């Protein structure tokens, strides 16, 4: 189906404890494929998926240079942002950036992204047009004016429509064994008595890839959204994900409850009930 490539970057200042730490990771879909950490003993971009290992030394040299240069511009940016927000030099602050592209099944660009946050808050984002900006506040408007003057958006558009899409196509081919395989959830329902009057029903989804899933409970065919405890989808550590959804069921009502599961690896959505 559709696919994405995303690069994530975080710099965190630590006054009195050296220079800001810089961490960047790259993903295709929900698969980590590269990482760089400035606190590593000998910082280099390193592979994290088998299909990127075949890239040759020129790729790793170039990527490592880009990462080191970005660590440095982030340090400058952290200094700039103290000025823009009238802040002291004493505190720790955070700068985040994400960029990348989404493509459809035919490999064509669906949309691109390039966006920043400062101290956990949206700062400036490239709009879906790849030509104009959304600034969150009057500080980000100063950046907007600078980036308009320098025609930054045009440079980003060229990358996002060109290299970003073409890299993703290459990776999807080289990684076709895994990137183009959906692992469906393994599903079951468990029952956990609470008191004489009620019990929990928990609907499980295990071992699935990619992470996107829908997992709901119905009672007599009516969605139980407000009464469902739905945990965040969580990584298993073997590339796959896990999720569960639970409801509190009055004694004797179990067969009125059904769990519904939707995932791209399922040819049809599943319906499950507790099986004593």
């Amino acid at each position: 189906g559709s696919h994405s490539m995303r690069y994530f970057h975080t710099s965190v200042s630590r006054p009195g404890r050296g220079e800001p730490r810089f961490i960047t990771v790259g993903y295709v879909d929900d698969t980590l494929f590269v990482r760089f950490d400035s606190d590593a003993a000998s910082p280099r971009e390193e592979p994290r998926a088998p299909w990127i290992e075949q890239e040759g030394p020129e790729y790793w040299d170039r990527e490592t240079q880009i990462c080191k240069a970005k660590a440095q511009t982030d340090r400058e940016d952290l200094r700039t942002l103290l000025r823009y927000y009238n802040q002291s030099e004493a505190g720790s602050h955070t700068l985040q950036n994400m960029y990348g592209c989404d493509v459809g099944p035919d490999g064509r660009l669906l949309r691109g992204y390039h966006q920043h946050a400062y101290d956990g808050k949206d700062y400036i984002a490239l709009n879906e047009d790849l030509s104009s900006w959304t600034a969150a506040d009057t500080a980000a408007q100063i950046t907007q004016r600078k980036w308009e003057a320098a025609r930054v958006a045009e440079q980003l558009r060229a990358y996002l429509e060109g290299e970003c899409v073409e890299w993703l196509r290459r990776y999807l081919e080289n990684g076709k064994e895994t990137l183009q395989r959906a692992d469906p959830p393994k599903t079951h329902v468990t029952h956990h008595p609470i008191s004489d009057h009620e019990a929990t029903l928990r609907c499980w989804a295990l071992g699935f890839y990619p992470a996107e899933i829908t997992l709901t409970w119905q009672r007599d065919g009516e969605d139980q959204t407000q009464d469902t405890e739905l945990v965040e989808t969580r990584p298993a550590g073997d590339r796959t994900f896990q999720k569960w959804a639970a409801v509190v069921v009055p004694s004797g009502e179990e067969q009125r409850y059904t769990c519904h599961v939707q995932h791209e690896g399922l040819p049809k959505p599943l319906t499950l009930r507790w099986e004593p």
Binding site: Y7, R62, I66, D77, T80, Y84, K146, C164
Partner: peptide
């Protein structure tokens, strides 16, 4: 592969 385009706020 990454964007090689220095961009400062």
């Amino acid at each position: 592969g990454r964007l090689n385009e220095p961009i400062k706020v």
